[PDB]
Amino acid sequence: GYTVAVVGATGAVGAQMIKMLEESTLPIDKIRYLASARSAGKSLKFKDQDITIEETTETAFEGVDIALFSAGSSTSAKYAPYAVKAGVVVVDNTSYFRQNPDVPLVVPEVNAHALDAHNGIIACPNCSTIQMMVALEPVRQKWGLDRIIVSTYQAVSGAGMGAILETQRELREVLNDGVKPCDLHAEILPSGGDKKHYPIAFNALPQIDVFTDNDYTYEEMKMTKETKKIMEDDSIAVSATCVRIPVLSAHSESVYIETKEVAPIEEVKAAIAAFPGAVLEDDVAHQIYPQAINAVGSRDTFVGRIRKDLDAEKGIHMWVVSDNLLKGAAWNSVQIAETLHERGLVRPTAELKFELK
Amino acid sequence: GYTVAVVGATGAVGAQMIKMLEESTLPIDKIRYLASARSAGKSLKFKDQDITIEETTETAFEGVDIALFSAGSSTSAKYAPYAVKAGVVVVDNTSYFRQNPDVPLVVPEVNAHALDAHNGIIACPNCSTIQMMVALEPVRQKWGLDRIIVSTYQAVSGAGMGAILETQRELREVLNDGVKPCDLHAEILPSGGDKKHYPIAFNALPQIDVFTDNDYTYEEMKMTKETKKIMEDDSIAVSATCVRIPVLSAHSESVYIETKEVAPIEEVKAAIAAFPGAVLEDDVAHQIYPQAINAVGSRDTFVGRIRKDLDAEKGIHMWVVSDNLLKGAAWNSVQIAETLHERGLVRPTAELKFELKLE
Ligand SMILES: NC(=O)c1ccc[n+]([C@@H]2O[C@H](COP(=O)([O-])OP(=O)(O)OC[C@H]3O[C@@H](n4cnc5c(N)ncnc54)[C@H](OP(=O)(O)O)[C@@H]3O)[C@@H](O)[C@H]2O)c1
Ligand SMILES: NC(=O)c1ccc[n+]([C@@H]2O[C@H](COP(=O)([O-])OP(=O)(O)OC[C@H]3O[C@@H](n4cnc5c(N)ncnc54)[C@H](OP(=O)(O)O)[C@@H]3O)[C@@H](O)[C@H]2O)c1
Ligand code: NA
């Protein structure tokens, strides 16, 4: 079997990567947990086995076959090239390698073929992007895609473990202490790295990540550029508004598309239902539609509210929901690792294409 | 001065109607609070005065100059025509009279001119519609509007007092008792009238009101049809997705528009800032944008995240936030009443144009 390393094992995604690996089919002979120096020495479970957390260093990757990175862009930038040098195949959850031409940006149901020519690093797309790709690929295959307009309803777990705890504290201070939401103190959201912080309790924050030069945030721009790479079509127009809402787990998306050819709605529903990873939850007569709370804990992407635009001949609206820590992150990574195993792609890379930092 | 009646004084909107009337310039000689049999006999404050709540009847409107209705569509359907017959001018918050050709559907900053030919009933648009009209009207005036695509982030107070309490209860059960959101019992949301109910706590429900025969909800279709009437242009293409989120007060909206002529973003910002009732909150360098929690308690509509589409030349995205109980409901109604006073339009209507349902 393989030696599998989890880099960032203590975090929000890291905990779910452990769960996904525990339930995986991957033949694992040895599992290692990697994090920062402050977590080194602490014990963490794998099934009913005790694993000691190690510090992530340049020389900590010898003997490793697969490394699952989920410890922030900074950690992947520094240590992933050393992993590749050690013969590891890296699956990275961070944004750092996503737009590198030598790095496949993969959603297994959409572009597994991109894995074949990998150079030691496979990039997982952004959580908000992934679920959109699963929903839209079956539509693109049959009727094409001209444009996408998306407004997101994103969970706080997307910003990490700290953001969950901040959201929970704030809500308790309003409900238990009677503090007005506008008077709350915040330290993480909307973006930990940014200059100012705002409450999320009873709020909708139209900022995820930091702002770019064109007044869109990096989150919105990631959705644009990642879609183009994943679907291998730069002509697809994509514009996004990414919003954080008071939900702990699971992202929701209001998605508008225009197809190249008129796509009958009942055929659209059937195509999405037949697509691997996508579940049709669409029966308005019985108020059936995807819901954040129902999606939590599931690997599937749930699609509903499918209806044609009231005016645009080729326009379609839909509602897309998936667990941001699973398909949005940890499950997508483990699924990639499983696909790599299937295709005999877990082996050292001879040519090193990534600069050592 | 006027005798003013508040119909549905005990509800979520009613409480804000009282606050808005207390802070109003309207000369009020007498205030009357009307509700259902459930609240009749109880007492509510108007400033310092104790006002006894009365049961709403067909005969309750004698001597009333202005009646502000926010007590459900059935209440307006049953009693508003009797108020008009009695000589009252009605301002209605419900959906019942909104699409009636004899009824002005008014946002004062957009179409106050429609008030002049009123027949005793003036309709307030839906809360989600109003704030979008305030944000978009200045844009339409200069560059026109071809289409609108909107996804809403709506507060639970939109569904009434019971919905607020249900949301607070559910959140307290999860955060204090450790109840799983999936295990929560719901009774009201997404829609009180509909067959099935779902938890809102840590959830996003893509249903507001009930579904229509075209698979859009009534909320989504009201945004479409109300826009066309308010802006007096049936050619404006409008499609909406309306979603309830775990917020008590203030709706937020992600609005996409395509203009008729290219509208420079810096000029769009300036036009919105200059428009009465609209406040520009747009400085991304300092992370300034409209926020639900900041809009609560304010009559203004806040607009930000204004940016052109990445591909469509005439496309613009923006973020619109307003208190759904104020500009979305109570303040719009009071503002209409004040405008009626300004234009000398508070007087009886001679010809009855609305069916009496209790004959
Ligand atoms: N959360 C999501 O829904 C989501 C979805 C897709 C992608 N991602 C991406 O995944 C990454 C992690 O997200 P998260 O939500 O899991 O964050 P998180 O909860 O804050 O966890 C961060 C993890 O990184 C580790 N770490 C920090 N600095 C390190 C260092 N210098 N060396 C080694 N390990 C270090 C931490 O270990 P210690 O405990 O020792 O500090 C911790 O385990 C982010 O880059 C994010 O963009 C997240
Ligand atoms: N909430 C919003 O953001 C919003 C915005 C725009 C428009 N509206 C509209 O306003 C209306 C209600 O507003 P809300 O959200 O404040 O609802 P709410 O909190 O549930 O209050 C409903 C009010 O209606 C009264 N009522 C019920 N049945 C009655 C009857 N048979 N006769 C006389 N009064 C009766 C109730 O009085 P009792 O206490 O005696 O039961 C109560 O005061 C709805 O039609 C809604 O469409 C609401
Ligand atoms: Na499927």
Short mmCIF file of C-alpha atoms in Angstrom, two decimals, chain B residues 80 220 229 244 278:
data_model
loop_
_atom_site.label_atom_id
_atom_site.label_comp_id
_atom_site.label_asym_id
_atom_site.label_seq_id
_atom_site.Cartn_x
_atom_site.Cartn_y
_atom_site.Cartn_z
CA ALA B 80 -59.94 48.05 2.96
CA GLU B 220 -39.91 35.98 -7.22
CA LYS B 229 -45.56 48.51 -12.85
CA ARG B 244 -34.32 33.20 3.29
CA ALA B 278 -30.18 55.90 -1.56
#
